[PDB]
Structure formats: C-alpha cells, structure tokens
Amino acid sequence: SGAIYVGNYRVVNRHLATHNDWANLVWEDSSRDLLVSSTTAQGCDTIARCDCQTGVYYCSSRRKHYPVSFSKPSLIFVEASEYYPARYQSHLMLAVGHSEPGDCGGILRCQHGVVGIVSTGGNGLVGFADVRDLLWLDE
Ligand SMILES: Cn1ccc(NCc2ccccc2)n1
Ligand SMILES: [Zn+2]
C-alpha cells in the first residue's frame, strides 16, 4: 500500500483505490494502474520533473529502500494478476529488484522528487507507474 500526496491530490494504484478515492475521482487510467482523488488537506510531496533513470524505492516486504537503475516509461506486456487480465500497461518503468503485490504504493524517488509508485512485479523485476508526466498534479 501507499500513495503520493501533492497539493489537493492523492495518487494511488488504481487497483488499491478505496470507495472514498472513487467518490472523489479526479482522473484514472486503467492501462497505467493510477487513480488520482481530491483531498481536503494539502499535500507536501514534490513530483520529479526530469528523465532520471536512477533513484530509490521503498520495499514494504523488506522494510528497506533500494537504489536502482530503471527503464524509461513504456508500454510493457504485464501478465494477469487478480486485479487485471493480461494487458499492455503504459508509462511503466522496470528495475531489477524485489517486489511482491503488497509492495504496490511504494514510492520511487530521485533528487528531483517523486518519480512514481510500485505497480507490478515478477521474474525479479519491479515495475513502477510513472507520474512525472502529469504536470497538472503541480497546480
Ligand atoms: C509489485 N509486484 C506485483 C507482483 C510482484 N511480484 C510477483 C509476485 C506475485 C505474487 C506473489 C509473489 C510475487 N511484485
Ligand atoms: Zn530526477
């Protein structure tokens, strides 16, 4: 679990979105596994605006942060999970690293701020859902 809190927005994995998130829907994209919901308390988080391919993610299954090299956001085939059938996830970045389903919501961050959130895994790669392209989160 976990989310990004920036201005009056809450960013979560779409598949982990609560009733409250959907009642306060701002934007969702199923192919990205993201949902943004409106918040009544302001958010302090800084979103990275950059094309960094290095940083650090939180791994709740290890209670520890890991430094990684990651791919640029892309269209990667992702196997069926429970929450989705097999489909092309968009804006996905991969790193060689440990993750399990409950690690979703873990933040990936670089020196510029939040890059994205853990979204999928398998075969020893962690996938993160990129948020740096959503310039509207910083208004
Ligand atoms: C973020 N994330 C989703 C799946 C995953 N790792 C693959 C996996 C699936 C089920 C049990 C154990 C490991 N990491
Ligand atoms: Zn950066």
> Residue 29 is part of which domain span?
3-44
Technique employed here was X-ray
Whether 49 and 64 share a structural domain: yes
Q: What are phi and psi of 79, to 5 degrees?
A: -60, 150
Residues 8 and 38 in one domain: yes
Residue 50 assigned as binding residue: yes
Give, as residue ranges, everything with CB less than 5 Å from ion ligand 2: 48, 50, 52, 110, 112
User: And the tokens for 84?
Assistant: 């989705």
Q: Which of the following is catalytic: 21, 91, 103, 104?
A: 104
- Residue 61 and residue 29 share a domain: no
On whether the CB atoms of residues 130 and 76 are closer than 8 A, the answer is no
Among the options 15, 45, 59, 65, which is catalytic? 15
User: By the 8 A CB rule, do 129 and 16 touch?
Assistant: no
All residues at 6 or more sequence positions from 139 whose CB lies less than 8 Å from its CB, including other chains: 7
* Same structural domain, 40 and 85: no
Same structural domain, 65 and 24: no
> Looking at the 3D structure of the chain, how many domains does it have?
2
- Virtual torsion, Cα 5, 7, 28, 131, nearest 10 deg: -70
Q: How many CA atoms lie within 13 A of 136 on its CB side?
A: 6
Given the structure tokens 């859902």, which residue do they identify?
129
Resolution in A: 1.4
Candidates 2, 4, 1, 7; CA nearest to 41 is: 7
Residues in the chain: 139
- 107 Cβ inside 6 Å of ligand 1: no
**Residue 35: which residues within 8 A CB-CB, separation 6 or more?**
11, 12, 13, 14, 17, 21, 22, 25, 27, 28
Q: Going by DSSP bridges, is the β-strand pair 4-13/34-44 parallel, antiparallel, or unpaired? A: antiparallel
